[PDB]
Amino acid sequence: EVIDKKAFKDMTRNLYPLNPEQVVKLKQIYETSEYAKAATPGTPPKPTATSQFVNLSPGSTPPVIRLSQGFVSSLVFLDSTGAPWPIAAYDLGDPSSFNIQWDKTSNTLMIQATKLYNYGNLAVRLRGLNTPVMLTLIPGQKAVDYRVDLRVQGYGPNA
Amino acid sequence: RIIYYIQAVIPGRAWLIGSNGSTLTVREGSKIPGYGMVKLIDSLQGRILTSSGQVIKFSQEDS
């Protein structure tokens, strides 16, 4: 009957080649590999909610929006009084590097950088503004702008 | 003092219920009031060795 015992030993080694200890070994190795794969290189961008004043006079530099790949950066447009300024339309140059979500009524644009370091620009024609708002979108910076409050120079339809 | 029993145990965390109806969850090293600090959590036996020598187990009328 020792044949039965040793055959069962070889049997249970073939059925479960990974020991209960080696199973936790493999699981830990897999989790470590996933952590290494999902770890960002260097310091992740600091998530900041900034506020800028948009000066539309000639000679002024268009505002910069710090984006990050796969992260949502929301621009809300406000007049000098801080009231919302609805968006009439927008024009996205190089829309293969940025994805913009915007319900057609509100004043908030939500841009997600599809590419790591490819930067571009954007035009935002507001409701009462003849002069479009020009912005430069730059991803892959040491800061990521979760929300930007763009204080346009004019006075919007809300006072 | 207050007696703590194991409500549930898994590798790592362990949910405990005391005599007051309070519920906690403890890890490898974790402070338990009266029992000291957790030293080991045996999930297979449902045992918890603490630093004060007291052992936390499933309640007698619960296991």
Partner: peptide, 9 residues
């Protein structure tokens, strides 16, 4: 840090 399944005297 210890997983009890990998227990052996």
């Amino acid at each position: 840090c210890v997983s009890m399944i990998g227990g052996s005297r």
